[PDB]
């Protein structure tokens, strides 16, 4: 966390507090009936003309949580518990799916997955990286501007704050490892059309948010920043047409008070 | 070099933090981070890949603050690294290969080499050849005087990872008989359907100290970052396949170590 002088941990009757919320997935939400899905995915006519519609693009989810006011003292995020909410829903293999074979059940949700979650004293800081720099990201999303071929591997122009929902497409932004001093981020990409979902749930697993120096994220502005993505895979419709399917993520963050100079 | 005690005090630690880009073959002005669509030799004997079909080791020499018989050297103590731009692999709509009627495109997948090293000098390479009759293309540094023994082991094929866009990945490996002064880590997963699995986190530190609590020592006040991250192949609409690479972030803690001679 750092940036300011991190002094000693204040103890007492009111030195600890808890945030506990859920973050919903923005998977593209085609129509009034498909919250948590994307629009059935289409493929560009040409490599040069890639231009996905906004409702075909999953996005990072973010939540600013206001904490009990202080004043310096700052709130220190100490522990996280998180799990994906509604894992069993992925066993619904009967809702106009693709029969895997004659008299087969539907092909279950599976394939390319990004499970990611961050706890920060400020916005998650993003670096842009593009699969194809000539991809035209659709009106209404915040995307890397002034894309060059260098954007495809690394281009330090593409910095940004995860400060808005339904905004930052997943496929062109990643945590910027050159700057998230005040955030703890964890994510995994598994790529492949047949990748099986593997989702663990438990109320027994705590993750500690303290760094090498025993300091957790420090909540600037008395704000805690929960960010998450949980693209679980794709739903295969009867036709074979595929929609990304997302799930909400639970957070419970223990916080304590840290004395700070300036 | 006899290694003496660790200097502590007001300015005894320092940090390098950079990114290394991937040299995957970079066909044309528009395809940085890809290889050229892969072709297959007419015969086993005539294997001769074009330079733009050959991923290469990436290397970066970082000059450190000046310090200096009884002298000081920078000791690399910890590394943090992750692949930058993992999410970009979810782009399944950019003229890919529909896995089936109305399917999304086949995502980047298949044969992968993720490798990274931290050294007080160049990574030291041993040459090993899949096929010793393979002619490595004009403009790459490759094993010279290939014999059939080159296919299993041939100690002639030594070299320094001292140049970018130079050393093809498929004919060089870290030389395990050397690299005293480097810490290297890599994994090959082979197979056309191997799923990419890329973890990212700013919470994972790796220690670079050996059995004796000494990290790499930066000869000439230079730190050597080497990396390869061939993530898999992009399958075009035609079925033609291009290697796809990604940048690697490094952040290395260094401290000062007293040394004789």
């Amino acid at each position, epitope marked *: 966390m750092g940036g300011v002088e991190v002094l000693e941990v204040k103890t007492g009757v009111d030195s600890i507090t808890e945030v506990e919320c859920f973050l919903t997935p923005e998977m593209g939400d085609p129509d009034e009936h498909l919250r948590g899905f994307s629009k059935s995915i289409s493929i560009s006519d*040409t490599f*040069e003309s890639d231009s996905p519609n906004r409702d075909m693009l999953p996005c990072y989810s973010v939540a600013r949580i206001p904490l009990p006011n202080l004043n310096i003292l700052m709130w220190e995020a100490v522990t996280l518990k998180t799990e994906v909410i509604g894992v069993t829903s992925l066993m619904n293999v009967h809702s106009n799916g693709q029969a895997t074979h004659d008299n087969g059940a539907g092909k279950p949700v599976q394939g390319t997955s990004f499970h990611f979650f961050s706890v920060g004293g400020e916005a998650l800081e993003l670096q842009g990286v593009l699969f194809n720099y000539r991809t035209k990201y659709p009106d209404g999303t915040i995307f890397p501007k002034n894309a060059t071929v260098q954007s495809q591997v690394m281009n330090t122009e593409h910095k940004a704050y995860l400060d808005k929902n339904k905004a930052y497409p997943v496929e062109c932004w990643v945590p910027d490892p050159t700057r998230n001093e005040n955030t703890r981020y964890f994510g995994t990409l598994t790529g492949g059309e047949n990748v099986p979902p593997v989702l663990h749930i438990t109320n027994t697993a705590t993750t500690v948010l303290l760094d090498e120096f025993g300091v957790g994220p420090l909540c600037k502005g008395d704000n805690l920043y929960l960010s998450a993505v949980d693209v679980c895979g794709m739903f295969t419709n009867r036709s074979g047409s595929q929609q990304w399917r997302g799930l909400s993520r639970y957070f419970k963050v223990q916080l304590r008070k840290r004395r700070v100079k300036n | 070099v006899e290694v003496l005690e660790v200097k502590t005090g007001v300015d005894s630690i320092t940090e390098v933090e950079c990114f290394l880009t991937p040299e995957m073959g970079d066909p044309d*002005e528009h395809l940085r981070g890809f290889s050229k669509s892969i072709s*297959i030799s*007419d015969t086993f004997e005539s294997d*001769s890949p*074009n330079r733009d079909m050959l991923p290469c080791y990436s290397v970066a020499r970082i000059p450190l603050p000046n310090l200096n018989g009884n002298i000081l050297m920078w000791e690399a103590v910890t590394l943090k690294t992750e692949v930058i731009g993992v999410t970009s692999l979810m782009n399944v709509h950019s003229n890919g290969q529909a896995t089936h009627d109305n399917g999304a495109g086949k995502p980047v997948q298949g044969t992968s080499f993720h490798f990274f090293s931290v050294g007080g000098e160049a990574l030291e390479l041993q040459g090993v050849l899949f096929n010793y009759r393979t002619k490595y293309p004009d403009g790459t540094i490759f094993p010279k005087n290939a014999t059939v023994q080159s296919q299993v082991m041939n100690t002639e094929h030594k070299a320094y990872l001292d140049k970018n866009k130079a050393y093809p990945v498929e004919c060089w490996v870290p030389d395990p008989t050397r690299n005293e002064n480097t810490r290297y880590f890599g994994t090959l997963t082979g197979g056309e359907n191997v799923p990419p699995v890329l973890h990212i986190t700013n919470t994972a530190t790796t220690v670079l100290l050996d059995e004796f609590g000494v990290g790499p020592l930066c000869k000439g006040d230079n730190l050597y970052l080497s990396a390869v991250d061939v993530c898999g192949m992009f399958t*075009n609409r*035609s079925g*033609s396949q291009q290697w796809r690479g990604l940048s690697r972030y490094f952040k290395v803690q260094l401290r000062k170590r007293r040394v004789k001679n």
Partner: antibody
Amino acid sequence: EVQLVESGGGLVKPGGSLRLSCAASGFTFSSYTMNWVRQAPGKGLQWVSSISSSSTYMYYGDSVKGRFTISRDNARNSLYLQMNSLRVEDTAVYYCARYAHDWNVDYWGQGTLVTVSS
Amino acid sequence: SVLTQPPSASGTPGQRVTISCSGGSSNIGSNPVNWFQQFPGTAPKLLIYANTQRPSGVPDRFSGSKSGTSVSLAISGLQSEDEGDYHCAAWDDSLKGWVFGGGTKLTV
């Protein structure tokens, strides 16, 4: 649909000059490398010249090295071929063709006739 | 660094005809072949791309095979509407340009 339309072709005397126009409608012309290919009456096809999306890379067939010049105006959705020092052999239908990655040369225009005679 | 295809080919309606295109490492070895179909007094049109692939609108009858430096086009279930010139094309890395074949007039 994608439509390319060539124009500017006609009758010109040896040593003569001539500017050909390709009008692109149906696609972002500014995103693709574009080609000229010609066909001498009764003979096969022969590539003339390529130009990159941003006019960074122009290439020419040897048969017209030094005489022809390719150019594009991405604002006017138009590809041009400047033909100087025209010869009898240069008589052909001049096709305008798009190159797309993986698809390679895909769409052709209707062609425009260039006859160089006395 | 020239593409060599038969100047003419022919067949009986219903037959499979095969037009070959032979190049070198500099072109077909390292670069894909597109086939273009040309009827008299019209432009060339894309028939096969990337050695072996059909754009939408080309019947299953039309097919390709690649073996190293040589490719072939296969017109199966030959029909009269298939009478025309078949053009073989591929990029050449050394000439930095497109090379074509002679053309193949298919008579039925």
